[PDB]
Design a binder for these strands. Structure first.
Ligand SMILES: [Zn+2]
Ligand SMILES: [Zn+2]
Ligand SMILES: [Zn+2]
Ligand SMILES: [Zn+2]
Lengths: 463, 463
RNA sequence: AAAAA
RNA sequence: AAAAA
């Protein structure tokens, strides 16, 4: 009547954790990143960014005085009102780096959470500056500096670990939230770079050990998941810049470099090259003086003794007049304005509102890409047009991406071996690219690979 | 009553040279380059290329057997029948380098001119191979090797001077034709590179002295005159390739590199990297063995003693079987097939016609761009699809251009200071980009800057 | 921006 | 793929 047809060994389940991955902002769009990681009933928020182009389509603005509510309806900033419906209390706000798509909403949203803001030293300095420029909401949460390679226990069941990575701004980290059932890893804005010009190589060994210890969930950017291969090193940008600036038969001509003021590795390269060209490096622009000065005070870069740095309009204009009457061949201005922003140094030069006059053959070196949004493309087209009309020669995109490409994501998947993967930090189209890559690596959509929309919570019941 | 005055010029002179610039091929399209430079009644032909896509649009076509005329009506090769209306006699055929768009039509056209063929040593070697493959015309012309930095007297009134430059094939030169009335310079297929990984830096000093001695006319490629800035050095390709091959946590995986067989610098870099990865470099493909072997026999590259090189199908399949049964982690195959050409090694691997089996995670590295014509895009799309369907990971465009960008052209104008400029080697769209640059430099179209079409002769007289 | 065999 | 002042 009866036969044996199987024996199955059952596993043990000594710890049970409920994990929630809540997509708040930056999952339907570029910008305004914010994620919530719930461990049972405690929550770690990671990043609170701004989406700058939603500010740029309205012309009055000034975000420093607008209320959270109106910025959420412009969106602009993440709609964190969904957090009233998430079953837990926030115990920390973590920011992975200092770009505005990760910290820009801090002075608008952070003050409603009874939680410290935790970041790397440079990032905490920039968060403090952002909060001091705010004055409709009174913000200062506790701000805690945590370095790459260190841990901080938030709850007896939750610890936060910073893992060094590389990116287009210094002191970027992966975040590992350790729970009784394993680690949730957040890897948004990162780049593998084995020859960084500043900082250290990403901590591949520790990525491997976390992979073997157990990752419940990887949250990672999909921004360049559709670019084939691997991201070129920042060393490539450094060498291209060096050859643009030094490899020329026209060395006595006027030259201006413009780049992201927060790209401290790029600025560092430019300043060193200035020494090699026998020119005096002159950093111009409030943002240049703030970001680079801050990096210098924290020991992140050294600066030559002859560097000059001006952030105020009168010293900027004075410095430009000095440059003009001493000979542009004697200086290397490094200035704000690479996206044609209004008020920035290079835009004021291009409008003729400055003692510096561009002349035929002067070289303007954009050590940056054009942000692919129509607003910034218009500003940059107007700026470039004005400079070309005065005879400038344009060297564009002397630059490499700050983001991981498809094969970098492949290797990060192979090292962290997460049980579940969640693309973040992009449009649904970018997540589509990431999804195809993750399925070539063995993941299945809706099972171990998850596509979230803003406002959606993924529940993971881990045994 | 009324009155004015005027000084009548003297008729006295205080020999007259007529220059003809004849566009034969490559002025309306990419490929099939050919220019004739007439000095009164002597003519120097420069280049006789083939245009390969006009061959690829016809199925089962053996150009080695076709007559000149039918290839001209395919166009394909330059229509030199216009030379029956040019009032001069050809005294020399110069080739600036060994790419097929400069030498491919030599065995179809050169034999009707009572003239030597003059080129650099590597280029004469490749021209001899091109003539040995020809099965329709018996060719015939004396072949003369002239090195960069040397001069050769062609006529009592005409000498030819080779000036060293850089390009994606070794031994490329600018050509300066000296006439009683000054120099006509031909710079088609050049790149400024101050850190080449093979050969010497372009001879900038001699370009400057040529500018001051007097250049009547510059004929120069417009290929990338629309790319802003300056061409990245070949060292950039060398470092990106090095980081793709060495900068990885998955080093025991299968890796294949494919690149242009004639790009001896790239091949050299790859072979050295193989030594550094502890893998054995194995070059595969008839073209690879011919181009690389020729470079080695002439002392243009050294090769490690553990190199293996197979050009015949039997030795290639045997080598791939050895690779498979010894472990793909022990070899770095460097092979033909980067444009998905049929019959090339990587296409045969991708079709499963080979003992080598692509497996999940194997890395296929294209150290090359996809040629932008629909035929080649179709081949490369079919190849890439087949490789991806077997689990391959594709690293594409690990590569920098072989051609001057807009600002390289700017500086070359600044150094040669030609009285007249003629874009060549491209479509009218590329010449359009070049024209905008040359007018920023002071030239005027139809006066000192000239847009020519295939079949047209430009007359330049002494004032 | 050039082939491949 | 990020601002500027
Ligand atoms: Zn970022
Ligand atoms: Zn970001
Ligand atoms: Zn060429
Ligand atoms: Zn060419």
């Amino acid at each position: 009547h009866h036969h044996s047809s199987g024996l199955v060994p059952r596993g043990s389940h000594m710890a049970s954790t409920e994990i929630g991955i809540i997509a708040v902002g930056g999952y339907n769009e570029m910008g305004r990143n914010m994620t919530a990681i719930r461990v049972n009933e405690d929550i770690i928020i990671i990043d609170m960014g701004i989406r700058l182009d939603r500010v740029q389509i309205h012309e009055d603005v000034d975000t420093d005085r607008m209320h959270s509510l109106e910025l959420i309806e412009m969106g602009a900033i993440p709609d964190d009102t969904i957090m009233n419906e998430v079953n837990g209390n926030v115990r920390a706000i973590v920011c992975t780096h200092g770009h505005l798509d990760h910290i820009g909403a801090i002075p608008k949203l952070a003050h409603r959470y009874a939680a410290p803001i935790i970041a790397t030293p440079y990032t905490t300095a920039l968060i403090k500056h952002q909060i001091d420029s705010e004055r409709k909401f009174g913000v200062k949460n506790n701000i805690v500096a945590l370095k790459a390679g260190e841990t901080l226990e938030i709850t007896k069941d939750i610890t936060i670990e910073f893992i060094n990575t590389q990116h287009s701004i210094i002191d970027t980290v992966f975040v590992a939230i350790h729970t009784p059932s394993g680690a949730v890893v957040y890897a948004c804005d990162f780049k593998f770079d084995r020859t960084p010009t500043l900082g250290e190589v990403p901590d591949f060994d520790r990525l491997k050990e976390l992979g073997k210890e157990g990752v419940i969930a990887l949250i990672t950017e999909s921004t360049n998941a559709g670019r084939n291969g691997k991201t070129p090193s920042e060393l490539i940008a450094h060498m291209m810049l060096k050859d643009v600036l030094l490899g020329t038969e026209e060395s006595a001509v006027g030259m201006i470099v413009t780049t992201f003021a927060a790209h401290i590795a790029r600025v560092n390269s430019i300043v060193q090259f200035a020494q090699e060209m026998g020119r005096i490096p002159v950093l111009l622009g409030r943002s240049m003086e703030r970001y680079v000065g801050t990096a210098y005070q924290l020991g992140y870069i050294d600066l030559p003794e002859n560097v000059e740095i001006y952030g105020s309009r009168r010293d900027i204009d004075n410095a430009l007049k000095k440059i003009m009457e001493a000979g542009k061949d004697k200086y290397l201005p490094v200035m704000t304005g690479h996206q044609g922003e209004p008020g920035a140094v290079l835009g004021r030069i291009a409008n003729g509102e400055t003692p510096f006059k561009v002349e035929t053959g002067d070289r303007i070196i954009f050590s940056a890409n054009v942000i692919p949004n129509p607003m910034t493309q218009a500003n940059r087209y107007a700026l470039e047009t004005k400079l070309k009309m005065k005879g400038a020669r344009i060297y564009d995109n002397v630059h490499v991406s700050g983001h991981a490409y498809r094969e970098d994501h492949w290797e990060l998947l192979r090292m962290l071996k997460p049980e579940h993967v969640i693309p973040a930090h992009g449009t649904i189209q970018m997540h589509s690219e990431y999804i195809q890559m993750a399925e070539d690596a063995g993941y299945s959509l809706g099972d171990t690979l998850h596509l979230l929309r803003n406002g959606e919570e993924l529940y993971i019941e881990e045994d």
